[PDB]
Symmetry: D2
Subunit: 296 residues, 4 copies
């Protein structure tokens, strides 16, 4: 299978006057490239995919593709939906805009059965000829892609090559790679990046890497090179910031931190997201001081 | 406050060859009207709101509004979204096209904070002058509207008049009505319709009533009259069908039951929803045989 | 031989308003005089039964001798009254639970409460055999007790109903499970059983669905209010029962701001009803902030003295 | 600190005609010693601690102490209780009868607060001069020793040197060793032995090792030697048996497997534990066929 692995960043989407700040978006991607990141994920959960329009979805994918052009850095475009017809359309558009592959979150809200998830992802994978990474995050979607369903999809669909797990379930991570060691298991939970990689996971799709791309990329590369002691050292050092970045729903903390670090102009969200509480604003700022934040 | 209470049905959306079957949709609503139902909810969760287009959403609301004219039956239009801008747009459409009120599910997938939920619903409520019922279903959305947030919205926004709860949490139901007895608590979980009503809830938004509208209407009206012996008797008798209608994710079982009773022409869903397993198909049929199902 | 048709055969029951008694300590010993005085106060404020050495009575840290002494005081104090003694007798070990059941029978308890085995997580078959052994060891009523947040296991509706139908003296269940759906499930499929509320905040919803009593924490502090709530409900005066349930919500919830019985003993101490705020380790006093919160919530209520 | 780490077995307690089979118990321990195990845990959860008398509990500890004489194998005696006075008494017995350390499960059923847990373990630790390992298993006890409480106990009490985690929470495993790298984190969940060891855990207290002691010992020793690839290979191979040994509550499956293997004479439990279902008995037998089970 063709794959997209390594250290990847779920890009925030900066807003300016209620609009996507396209100059800031490109500038933030160049900063990721300069700090060792292997791929960027425009318009995932961290990029506020649910509140962007389709036009804005396209704009972000195009900026990511153009900015990464000529670098080794790939674009794994967010393209999931609760509706299969919409997810198929987003997959086809992402392929046409030049994306290297697609990330596709399990349908949220409508709780498809395992048979329904299989048909959903089979339809998506059949619509394109680029790699497709499944994305399991049951705390947000209300459903779980089972290990059996993930493995069946990997085996039955040429394009489907692994899964981004955001499920707090290292047992499932063992289950997946013990029964199907050819798949690419990707960490979707920064605090446990190292345990997922040390069990044979092959990358991360990170929130923390927005702020500390050098540290998350180094963690990932240490682990892929089997230097577990050094990968664990960075994972341990990052625990405090990894946890505070979820003191409110992601991406409220990471955007707050990027604004405090001077990396975006304006702490703007799209409703129903909004600024953190005064107390959590202070906690994020405090945890940040313990880390060296790369500039532009 | 202007309110919409009583026995209400979360309408299924029939499909025929991939499109909304508009003749069947109207016929099903007339059947609800003729069996004692007080309001109908087009394009809620049970109506596959997440997989309908904007145009189909609007078509279903218009059919409901037209079919309920000249009757006492109200239209409480589904209008929720994960994006506040889209929820406001749907609210405004429902108002301008004659809906009596709106139902608005808590944003799914993006997990807004309580402050974000407050701002989300304040924007929706300020956009229309018709009643707004909140809708909490954490198992599907990934978030909870807290009791404090529900009560503040009810007290701060003239047209927010209560909440549809689908949370399995009778403690919260007591909390809500003990601290704000003027709100309209609406049961969103059929199996516990009677306990919610007997604590002072004032209606149901029912899945089971698609199949058995006369029974749910009678349960509700006995309860509103404090004829609790009779209301509990029906609630007890309905437990088996109330539970089997969730043997797979709603609306897979209820649409299956409607098809099995000849009330819709085709067992068609929009992906990622799909037909139930053959085993559950048979289980639903066997439970149906214990109930008296009205025709057209 | 055994059989599956006990459901409509005569079952002695213990229902109504019941109190899960705190166990007061003085210098680390059971304060036996205070214990009797607190029970008399329950009797005089309309309570129908008392539960010595349940969860609220710190059953896990009493010695077997102290457990037996508390049952004896409860039995002696309730003689000559309408008030029944439903003795705590559960255990993670079936052999211990049988021994406690037999003691309660031989020392004059009216019935036993028997919590689902904690920590060892028996299967539903194991729970069935556990309670079959207990029920067949005595001839007094047995109330099952489901509290999965504490035990790590659940007695399923099907197992509860099987036990009710298969054993003469098992007559119902005390539910502390935050699960009104299960409460409907139970009484819809087996309306002959006695469902007893084990969670004060939802006493009225359980009673209004046909539950027939409560085993209360709040009634340690406010026995007249819990008794009135229950008797109104049993008479189908649901307006008055709900009014009391709503008024009690604040205290009902603050009594669990830390693990029960830490808040209720704190409230009883603040009310002057016990001499010292003494627990047995690993239980201990609440945080200073929760101490203050409990004190504040109490102010809205009229607390009966002795 | 003095410590007890490495590959350890939570010993089953065999019964014959309702009594502890003392000869089988000693024979089973010798089998563990001869298959690479570093310590044995008499009368833990797997040993049916809840249904043994205090006399039987003490007998099992004495047999373990006697059988390990003349070997490097340590006895980490089960000594926990919901009552602090009982836990202190069991700790003092274990010390005075030659145990090398104690395992002490968090109080079950009565849900102490973190302050209560601290006072509980402080009292236990001060009662003896041998190592004390905390044991967190919230699914069984109804409470959780927080990371902060574990770390305070480790720092404040000379004897307390780590924690056995059976919590399905690799995030907390990271939390513990990131903030207090000097403690000994011990895996209490066989399926994730390798992830816990690869994060710097220093041992296991295993159920599976009752049946497959050579494989669990080899896994643990490869990990401790930083041969993570070979440790992961065994962890992956063992996943199927690791999971089937929990198809019913432990120790129902492990005793079933030991009986099927001819390692214990009769499939006897103490109520409320009992035989598995016919169906799960067959599932256990089938999974066993893929593994080489050492004899005596
Ligand atoms: N990635 C950019 C598009 C975001 C679109 C949408 N806001 C709504 C998508 C929708 N399928 C719209 C249904 C409209 C009829 N009710 C949904 O709400 O699930 C979402 O996916 O959350
Ligand atoms: N109700 C008064 C007696 C309390 C006894 C005990 N503390 C311990 C009971 C025991 N079966 C003892 C096991 C002894 C060997 N470890 C238990 O801990 O489960 C409990 O049940 O929690
Ligand atoms: Mg690279
Ligand atoms: Mg809605
Ligand atoms: Mg008497
Ligand atoms: Mg039945
Ligand atoms: Mg009367
Ligand atoms: Mg509570």
């Amino acid at each position: 299978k063709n794959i997209i692995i390594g250290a990847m960043t779920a890009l925030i989407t900066p807003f300016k006057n209620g609009k996507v700040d396209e100059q800031s978006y490109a500038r933030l991607i160049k900063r990721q490239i300069e700090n060792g990141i292997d791929a960027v994920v425009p318009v995932g959960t961290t990029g506020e995919s649910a509140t962007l329009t389709h036009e804005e979805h396209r704009t972000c994918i195009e900026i990511a593709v153009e900015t990464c052009k000529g670098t080794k850095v790939k674009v794994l475009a967010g393209a999931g939906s609760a509706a299969t017809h919409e997810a198929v359309g987003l997959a086809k558009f992402a392929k046409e805009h030049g994306a290297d592959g697609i990330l596709s979150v399990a349908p949220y809200y409508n709780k498809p059965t395992q048979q329904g998830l299989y048909e959903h992802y089979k339809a998506i994978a059949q619509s394109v000829d680029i790699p497709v990474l499944l994305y399991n995050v049951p705390g947000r979607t209300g459903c779980e892609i089972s290990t059996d369903t993930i493995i069946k999809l990997f085996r039955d669909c040429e394009n489907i090559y692994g899964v981004k797990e955001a499920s707090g379930n290292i047992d499932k991570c063992v289950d997946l790679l013990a029964h199907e060691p050819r798949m690419m298991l990707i960490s979707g939970e920064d605090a446990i990046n190292y345990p997922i990689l040390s069990n044979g996971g092959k990358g991360v799709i990170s929130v923390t890497s927005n702020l500390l791309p050098d540290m998350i990329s180094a963690l990932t590369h240490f682990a892929l090179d089997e230097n577990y002691k050094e990968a664990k050292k960075i994972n341990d050092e990052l625990y405090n910031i990894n946890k505070i970045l979820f003191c409110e729903s992601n991406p409220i903390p990471i955007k707050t931190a990027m604004y405090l670090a001077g990396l975006i102009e304006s702490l703007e969200f799209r409703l129903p997201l909004c600024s953190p509480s005064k107390e959590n604003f202070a906690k994020i700022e405090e945890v940040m001081k313990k880390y060296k934040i790369k500039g532009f």
